[PDB]
Amino acid sequence: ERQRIRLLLALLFGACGTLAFSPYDVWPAAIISLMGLQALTFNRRPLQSAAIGFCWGFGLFGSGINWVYVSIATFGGMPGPVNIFLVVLLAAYLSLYTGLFAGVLSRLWPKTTWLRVAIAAPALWQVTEFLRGWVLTGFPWLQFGYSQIDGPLKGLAPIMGVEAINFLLMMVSGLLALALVKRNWRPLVVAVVLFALPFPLRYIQWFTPQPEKTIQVSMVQGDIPQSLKWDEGQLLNTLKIYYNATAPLMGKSSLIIWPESAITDLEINQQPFLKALDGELRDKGSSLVTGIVDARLNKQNRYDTYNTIITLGKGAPYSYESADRYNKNHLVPFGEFVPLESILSSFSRGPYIQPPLSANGIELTAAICYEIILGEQVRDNFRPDTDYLLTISNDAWFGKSIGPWQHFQMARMRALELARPLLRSTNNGITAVIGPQGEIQAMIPQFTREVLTTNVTPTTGLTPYARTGNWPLWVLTALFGFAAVLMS
Ligand SMILES: CCCCCCCCCCCCO[C@@H]1O[C@H](CO)[C@@H](O[C@H]2O[C@H](CO)[C@@H](O)[C@H](O)[C@H]2O)[C@H](O)[C@H]1O
């Protein structure tokens, strides 16, 4: 048991946690990876244990974030070998937080007691992962709470959020890392009863369906090549693609959805098309919701370029100044704007709170692409009278990789936390309809030009996570943190 070998063990145990997420959905690999990280940091100095946490997260992020390489294969045009260093530094920067959790736990709790692994680690894991999702803009990717979307602890999610499952998974795997090292038989069962108490919670229908307001919703997946997506011209076909695919559905569907940045043009430059399209949807009796880029003039006669969603048709008449839209708030850290003080067009940030959308008597809370993984921001924009959850994205990058599935698995948790049907539309990613409990009602394969049409029923409940948020976990994190820190 030297310092050299424990680095390679955490490197592989970190890669074990990758299997916990989609498409693998091996949720025990989360507990196994949590046990491998929590046990390898026993009776060590902080500076040598931080190397284990740095090598553990580097195995986790090095296996679950490697799909960002093909993201640069389309944007940027780099020679190749430089993109690989970015993934390492991206994993290194994210591993600094994993190493920050391993170093602090070794300074205050060098003793291998149940207090460290069942009280301190679940609370410190909350503050560590939160800082990794707060510094700069935030990147809370690969949280083992999302692995329980198809697992046992899914009943605990609508009560205290996805981050609270990270708390209990660390709390269970902590007592599981105890009984595996100390060979004691008590915390093994104490881990299970704390793991078994949230199991009877996955049969509680917090919501209530409204079968009368059942509608037929259609969502279009145009499958536009990313190499020709933003190309000048060619968009005459893209509009002809959607319209020839949307027109036969305008008469009978009550709501039609197009993905993010579907119309590759400024909103002001395609006005004669939308005024003609809106007037046709009203005759048929349907509502259309699509995403488009907006270069809007501010009061200072300067343009703020936004990533926007607009509404058309019956129940939502079109207008360039209409309040029935949604601007992107949480921007991509480097795909749109620059976060640093200075360098060495930029997208503008929208409001943090926006009223839900409207379309033929339907209330929809929106979230563009990356914004769906922010459970607290989705909860804040959420309103009681909301009929469905809505999310549109463009996963053209990360092609043929495991990226979109990890992204897709996190979006299902938002429907479970809020008990609302989640409608998701993408360019070539996982386009599906998710029920109020993370169940996949319908889904179509990737890399295809198809249209998804199904029936949905709204809900009108209020989950404990919708009333409260992640603060009940912070209280449990505070009490677990305030009590365990004082002892040292
Ligand atoms: C053939 C279907 C199975 C594909 C298997 C991919 C490997 C299994 C998953 C390992 C983790 C993700 O693995 C990732 O997969 C992508 C996508 O194919 C591959 O990526 C590589 O091939 C793809 C084409 O598919 C290129 O566009 C990309 O620039 C290149 O890096 C690499 O292998 C790895 O970056």
Query: φ, ψ for residue 297 (rounded to 5)?
Result: -80, 130
Q: Cβ(226) to ligand 1 under 6 A?
A: no
Look up 260 and say whether it is catalytic. yes
Find, among 392, 323, 318, the residue nearest to 355 by Cα: 323
Q: 63: which residues sit within 8 A by CB, 6+ positions away?
A: 14, 15, 18
Strand duo 450-456 + 215-221: pairing: antiparallel
What b/e string do you get for 364-400 counting C-beta neighbours within 10 Å, with b at 16 or more? bbbbbbbbbbbbebbbebbeeebbbbbbbbbbbbbbe
Instruction: Write the CB contacts of 68 (distance below 8 Å, at least 6 apart in sequence).
Output: 86, 87, 90, 398, 403
DSSP 145: T
- Residue bearing tokens 């803009």: 137
Residue 183 Cα to chain centre, angstroms:
38
> 386 lies in which domain range?
215-468
Minimal CA–CA distance to 325: which of 390, 277, 372?
390
Q: Is 328 helix (H, G, I), strand (E, B) or coil?
A: coil
Which ligand 1 atom minimizes the distance to the CA of 67? 35
Which of 227, 401, 428 is the pocket-test mutation for ligand 1 (most atoms within 8 Å of CB)?
Answer: 401
The method of structure determination was X-ray
**Ligand 1 lined by 400 (C-beta under 6 Å):** yes
Tell me if 72 CB under 6 Å of ligand 1: no
Q: Which of 371, 377, 359, 355 lies closest to 411, judged by CA?
A: 371
Q: Strands 422-425, 255-257: parallel, antiparallel or unpaired by DSSP?
A: unpaired
The H or E element that residue 83 is part of is helix 81-108
H, E, C per residue of 112-143? CCHHHHHHHHHHHHHHHHHHHCCCCCCCCCCC
67 CA → ligand 1 middle, Å: 8
Q: Give the integer Cα–Cα distance in Å for 75 and 71.
A: 7
- Is the backbone of residue 227 left (phi > 0), alpha (psi -120 to 50) or beta? alpha
Token pair for 420:
């609302």
Breaks (C-N over 2.5 A) in the chain follow: 344
Q: Residue 264's closest CA among 427, 380, 412?
A: 427
User: Which residue among the candidates 129, 229, 267, 369 is catalytic per the annotation?
Assistant: 369
Q: Where are the beta strands (DSSP E) in 254-400?
A: 255-257, 263-266, 287-297, 303-313, 326-327, 357-358, 363-365, 388-392
State whether the beta carbon of 437 lies less than 6 angstroms from ligand 1: no
- Domain of 321, CATH number, reads 3.60.110.10
Residue whose CA lies nearest to ligand 1 atom number 31:
70
Q: List % helix, strand, coil for the chain (3-state, nearest 5).
A: 50, 15, 35
Residues in the chain: 488
Contact of 365 with 383, CB cutoff 8 Å:
yes
- DSSP secondary structure letters along 172-226: HHHHHHHHHHT--SHHHHHHHHHHHTTGGGGG---S-B-GGG-EEEEEEE----G
* Phi, psi of 12, rounded to the nearest 5 degrees: -80, -40
Report whether residue 68 contacts ligand 1, using a CB cutoff of 6 Å. Answer: no
Q: Which residue has the tokens 């889904």?
A: 443
Catalytic residue among 16, 163, 328, 417: 328
From the candidates 16, 55, 129, 260, which is the catalytic residue? 260
For the chain, state the CA radius of gyration.
Answer: 24
Contact between residue 74 and residue 216 where contact means Cβ atoms under 8 Å apart:
no
The first and second tokens of residue 30, run together, are 């989360």
Element of type H or E holding 376: helix 375-381
Residue 15's CB: how many other CB atoms inside 10 A? 20
User: How many whole angstroms from 68 Cα to the centroid of ligand 1?
Assistant: 11
Closest to 434 measured CA to CA, from 459, 451, 470: 459
User: Is the shortest distance between the CB of 401 and ligand 1 below 6 Å?
Assistant: yes
Q: How far apart are CA 390 and CA 405, in angstroms?
A: 18
For 291-300, b where at least 16 C-beta lie within 10 A, e where not — what string? bbbbebeeee
Q: What is the distance between the alpha carbons of residues 245 and 269, in angstroms, rounded to a whole number?
A: 22
Q: Determine whether 255 is exposed, middle or buried from the number of CB atoms within 10 Å of its CB (0-12, 13-18, 19+).
A: buried
d(CA 340, CA 343): 7
Tokens of 14: 């970190």
The answer to whether residues 416 and 149 touch, using CB atoms and an 8 Å cutoff, is yes
Give residue 446 CA to ligand 1 midpoint distance, Å.
15
Residues 6+ apart with CB under 8 A from 251: 284, 285, 286
Residue 223 backbone phi and psi in degrees, to 5: 55, 65
The CB of 485 under 6 Å from ligand 1? The reply is: no
Ligand 1 atom closest to residue 73's alpha carbon, by position in its atom list: 29
Ligand 1: which residue has its CA nearest to atom 13? 401
Strand partners, 287: 313
367 sits in the region (left: phi over 0; alpha: psi -120 to 50; else beta) called beta
